Amino acid sequence: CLDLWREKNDRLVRQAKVAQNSGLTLRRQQLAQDALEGLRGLLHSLQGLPAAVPVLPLELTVTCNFIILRASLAQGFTEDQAQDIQRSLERVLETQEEQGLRELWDSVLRASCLLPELLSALHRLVGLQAALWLSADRLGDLALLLETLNGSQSGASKDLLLLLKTWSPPAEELDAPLTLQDAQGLKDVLLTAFAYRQGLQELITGNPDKALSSLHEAASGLCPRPVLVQVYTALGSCHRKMGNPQRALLYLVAALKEGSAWGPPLLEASRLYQQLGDTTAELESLELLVEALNVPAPQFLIEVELLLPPPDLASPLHCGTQSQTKHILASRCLQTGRAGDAAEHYLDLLALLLDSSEPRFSPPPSPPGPCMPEVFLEAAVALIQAGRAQDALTLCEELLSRTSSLLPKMSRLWEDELPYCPLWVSATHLLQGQAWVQLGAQKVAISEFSRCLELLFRATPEEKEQGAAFNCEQGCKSDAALQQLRAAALISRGLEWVASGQDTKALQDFLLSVQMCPGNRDTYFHLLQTLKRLDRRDEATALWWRLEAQTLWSLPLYLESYLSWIRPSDRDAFLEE
Amino acid sequence: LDHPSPVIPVDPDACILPDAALCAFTLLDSVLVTLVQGPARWKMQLFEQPCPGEDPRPGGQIGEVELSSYTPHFLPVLCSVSPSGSSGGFTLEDALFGLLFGADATLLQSPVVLCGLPDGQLCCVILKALVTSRSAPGDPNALVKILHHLEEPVIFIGALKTEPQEDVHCDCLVAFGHHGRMLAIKASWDESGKLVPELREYCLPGPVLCAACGGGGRVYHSTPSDLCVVDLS
Ligand SMILES: [Zn+2]
């Protein structure tokens, strides 16, 4: 009977391995699921018995091949495999000699210390459940289990890496019922995988020196090329943090060469050149990366990728998609003052996002970045600085066309804090104004500035009373953004009274801007210039004293670039006059 | 359907994406949004589907997510809600579209996917926003959001042309409980010069068994007693 079950186990293992080596995406998974149903039915058949001595190492060979091919197909460990381990463990316990896995393991390893000749399968089962606790991040009691497996007097060694190094595989795995993978293949995997995970965790928490050691350990040994790439990139990140530029670059180049997936290398490159201040090379790295990301097998076995965690945002291995990076490029291009180029990139970004019907989807920037109206606004700001104001009007008008239905009906306009309007709407009138200024139209400019000013005071944007949508969480709520934008539009207006020759009205707007943001100093330059023109002495000195009484946090980017744009270079010189 | 006894058994050659844990799935133009039960947390996926007449393939997965809110007989339900200007689903009108899914969805002119789950709560996910990778994993708390928490399982989601006064620019959103909480939503822009949502939790009798939508705000549903009918128009 056990000959037939064992021949069946050997048949399904052979079937799973044929499927792994050969086949296409369907036929592979078809034979794999056929083998999976086979091992499930065989496990039920074997559990049909009360688990005596000769069924045990067969039941465990089946259980191992089952959790292996389960997690390789499901593409992740979970708790069903742990409960099947518990089942096999109760089968070991009730044969020879309940509460929880730790004490259960201690008692089963106590029974193995009696040495029944199935320790080759017990250590493999420990390997699989250790893999489970590792991918589930249950690191503490895993150390306890392996410390109980190895000698107990090595218990002061709390660090896991030495514990996995001391943990031997038990046997050469003699002619037992056949298995898909040996405990040595698990040993090498568990070492590199935990070393990687530990290295990255220590990296995020600001030990990019200690990380180097762990990663070299993870590099030396079983290391599949994809992770060797991610490791090298992490080494580039560690070097960039310490300071050492040239080793950093060396790691990055090596990573590019070995890699077929060289995004995160070039992102780290860019963050390096940013540290060095080689702005042109920085931009060139990102420029390259975009063309790079333009380009877009699961073996029935337990590999490292299954154990490696999905990466976070702090990681150097977080690399968004083509679109989130073309937006990084354009953001850094606008941050630098290459606005002609920045305009081209932003029109390529919006082309990606709105000419997206047919091809594979290109997503908008992630939520921690800008929402989609702030992408149109930064686009308009860029084209304004490029001297292309007649296009920044067709941009803003298209933004207010598509969201008309959202905009308020301005019947409150007659009734004149309570009603609601998000900042990006006000901001569009502000930019649509400054656009008319550059084309030289005083009247419609002061008109548009005034309309922006109205929306900022006769409505509140932070009305998160009724959660009606995917509202803008952060960019279009910040009170710092509101007060700086108020001040911005007041200034942008005041100068148009000056250009037209209505200096008293200009004075009123600059005064209000001073009342709103007294720690901006752009306000003061304009105010003191006006008072020095008309009535210099007393008020000028009175506002000097206000400044010296006074003497950026998280603004959106379209507002930062608008303020940096309008402000005059000779500010502090005049502020020292 | 050409497909060159009158019974014909299907060979597993016809199988495509045998994910073997997938609970529900729907289709949009060039895409095959599915929804697959993992362990406790259910996860939405999103695939290509090759536009030219080839081997009928899925393609490689564009995106996934994790419906973190759902922690488990009743299959869930999916509905596509593309807007006008951009398909088996329902096209809403722009004012409503903007009320429910916001500026992001309006501007990208992105289809939206409403999943009612057996839990009851009914979550939406924007597709254009749902592109992810092993270097870029889909963030649930950002990417999937939750209109309304019906207490009871979900049977049908639809949309209706109230005010009728194929591509009908629907105006009304309907959800339907097992135990008969109906819920309807429509756009107002009332009382303050602001767009507001119209919630109604109606309460029909019965265990509801199925639902559909007919011309002009009528909703044919079927209690255990008889095929009944409701008008919103
Ligand atoms: Zn915003």
Q: What is the DSSP string of B58-83?
A: --SEEEE---TT-------EEEE-PB
Give yes or no for a contact between A426 and A452, defined as CB atoms under 8 angstroms apart.
Answer: yes
Q: Does A324 contact chain B (CB < 8 Å)?
A: yes
Kindly identify which residue of chain A lies nearest to residue B30, measuring between CA atoms: A358
Chain A residues whose CB is inside 8 A of the B39 CB are: 78-80
Nearest to B194 among A319, A367, A420 (CB): A420
CA distance A156 to chain B (A): 36
Kindly identify which residue of chain B lies nearest to residue A370, measuring between CA atoms: B104
Kindly identify which residue of chain A lies nearest to residue B11, measuring between CA atoms: A30
Nearest to A405 among B51, B94, B194 (CB): B94
CA distance B223 to chain A (A): 32
Q: Does A488 contact chain B (CB < 8 Å)?
A: no
Give yes or no for a contact between A317 and A203, defined as CB atoms under 8 angstroms apart.
Answer: no
Q: Cβ–Cβ of B99/A468 closer than 8 Å?
A: yes
Distances (CA, A) of A348 to A8, A379, B98: 59, 10, 26
Distances (CA, A) of A47 to A20, A70, A71, A123, A128: 27, 18, 21, 21, 20
CA distance B212 to chain A (A): 26
Pairwise CA distance, residues B209 & A418, whole Å: 44
H or E element at residue B125: strand B122-126
Q: Does A24 contact chain B (CB < 8 Å)?
A: no
Pairwise CA distance, residues B26 & B34, whole Å: 6
**Single-letter code of the amino acid located at A406:** L
Give yes or no for a contact between A125 and A60, defined as CB atoms under 8 angstroms apart.
Answer: yes
- In the reported structure, the alpha carbon of residue A478 is separated from the centroid of ligand 1 by a whole-number distance in angstroms of 9
Nearest to A406 among B103, B142, B197 (CB): B103
Q: Cβ–Cβ of B192/A412 closer than 8 Å?
A: yes
Give yes or no for a contact between A330 and A342, defined as CB atoms under 8 angstroms apart.
Answer: yes
Kindly identify which residue of chain B lies nearest to residue A366, measuring between CA atoms: B129
- In the reported structure, the alpha carbon of residue B132 is separated from the centroid of ligand 1 by a whole-number distance in angstroms of 22
Pairwise CA distance, residues A387 & A433, whole Å: 15
A407, A470, A471, A472: best to mutate for the B interface, most B CBs within 10 A: A470
Give yes or no for a contact between A264 and A316, defined as CB atoms under 8 angstroms apart.
Answer: yes
Residues 6+ apart with CB under 8 A from A189: A131, A222, A302, A303, A304, A307
Q: Give the per-residue SS3 of A404-429.
A: HHHCCCCCHHHHCCCCECCHHHHHHH
* SS3 assignment, position B159: strand
- In the reported structure, the alpha carbon of residue A423 is separated from the centroid of ligand 1 by a whole-number distance in angstroms of 7
* SS3 assignment, position A528: helix
Chain B residues whose CB is inside 8 A of the A83 CB are: none
Q: Does A30 contact chain B (CB < 8 Å)?
A: yes
Residue environment code for A462-495, b if the CB has 16+ CB neighbours within 10 A, otherwise e = ebeeeebbbbbeebbbbeebbebbbbbbbbbbbb
Instruction: Please compute Rg for chain B using Cα positions.
Output: 19
> Taking CB atoms and an 8 Å cut-off, how many pairs form between chains A and B?
137
Q: Strands B122-126, B181-187: parallel, antiparallel or unpaired by DSSP?
A: unpaired
Give yes or no for a contact between A312 and A318, defined as CB atoms under 8 angstroms apart.
Answer: yes
Pairwise CA distance, residues B187 & B93, whole Å: 10
Q: Does A153 contact chain B (CB < 8 Å)?
A: no
Give yes or no for a contact between B198 and B188, defined as CB atoms under 8 angstroms apart.
Answer: yes
Nearest to B108 among A29, A360, A372 (CB): A372
Pairwise CA distance, residues B141 & B34, whole Å: 19
CA distance A434 to chain B (A): 24
Q: DSSP assignment of A455-524, as one string?
A: HHHSSBS---SS--SS---STTT-HHHHHHHHHHHHHHHHHHHHHHT-HHHHHHHHHHHHHH-TT-SHHH
Q: Which position has the token pair 């299959």?
A: B75
Chain B residues whose CB is inside 8 A of the A264 CB are: 135
Pairwise CA distance, residues B128 & B28, whole Å: 13
Pairwise CA distance, residues A244 & A390, whole Å: 47
B33, B62, B96, B108: best to mutate for the A interface, most A CBs within 10 A: B108
Pairwise CA distance, residues B176 & B189, whole Å: 25
Helix runs in A319-441, H state only: 322-336, 339-354, 372-385, 389-402, 412-415, 423-438
> Long-range contacts of range A382-387, CB-CB < 8 Å, 24 or more positions apart?
A382/A330, A382/A334, A382/A339, A382/A342, A382/A343, A382/A346, A382/A561, A383/A343, A383/A346, A383/A347, A384/A431, A384/A434, A384/A435, A384/A438, A384/A565, A385/A339, A385/A342, A385/A561, A385/A565, A386/A339, A386/A340, A386/A342, A386/A343, A387/A438
> Angle, to 10 degrees, between the axis of helix A372-385 and the axis of helix A339-354?
150
Chain A residues whose CB is inside 8 A of the B136 CB are: 318-321, 324
Q: Does A418 contact chain B (CB < 8 Å)?
A: yes
- In the reported structure, the alpha carbon of residue A137 is separated from the centroid of ligand 1 by a whole-number distance in angstroms of 36
Q: Cβ–Cβ of A408/B193 closer than 8 Å?
A: yes
Six-digit token string for A316: 């150097």
Kindly identify which residue of chain A lies nearest to residue B126, measuring between CA atoms: A470
Answer positive or negative: Cα dihedral of A188, A116, A59, A14: positive
Give yes or no for a contact between A31 and A15, defined as CB atoms under 8 angstroms apart.
Answer: yes
Kindly identify which residue of chain B lies nearest to residue A465, measuring between CA atoms: B196
> Long-range contacts of range A335-342, CB-CB < 8 Å, 24 or more positions apart?
A335/A557, A335/A561, A336/A279, A336/A283, A338/A283, A339/A382, A339/A385, A339/A386, A340/A386, A342/A382, A342/A385, A342/A386
Give yes or no for a contact between A228 and A198, defined as CB atoms under 8 angstroms apart.
Answer: no
Pairwise CA distance, residues B137 & A310, whole Å: 7
Residues 82-141 (A) with a CB less than 8 A from some CB of B = none
Pairwise CA distance, residues A337 & B37, whole Å: 50
Q: Does A29 contact chain B (CB < 8 Å)?
A: yes
Q: Which position has the token pair 């009247």?
A: A443
Q: Which position has the token pair 């066309």?
A: A401
Q: Cβ–Cβ of B98/A471 closer than 8 Å?
A: no
Q: Does A362 contact chain B (CB < 8 Å)?
A: yes
Give yes or no for a contact between A168 and A127, defined as CB atoms under 8 angstroms apart.
Answer: no
At residue B34, φ and ψ (nearest 5 deg) are -130, -175
H or E element at residue A219: helix A210-219
Helix runs in A223-310, H state only: 225-242, 245-258, 264-276, 279-293
* SS3 assignment, position A577: coil
Chain A residues whose CB is inside 8 A of the B142 CB are: 366-367
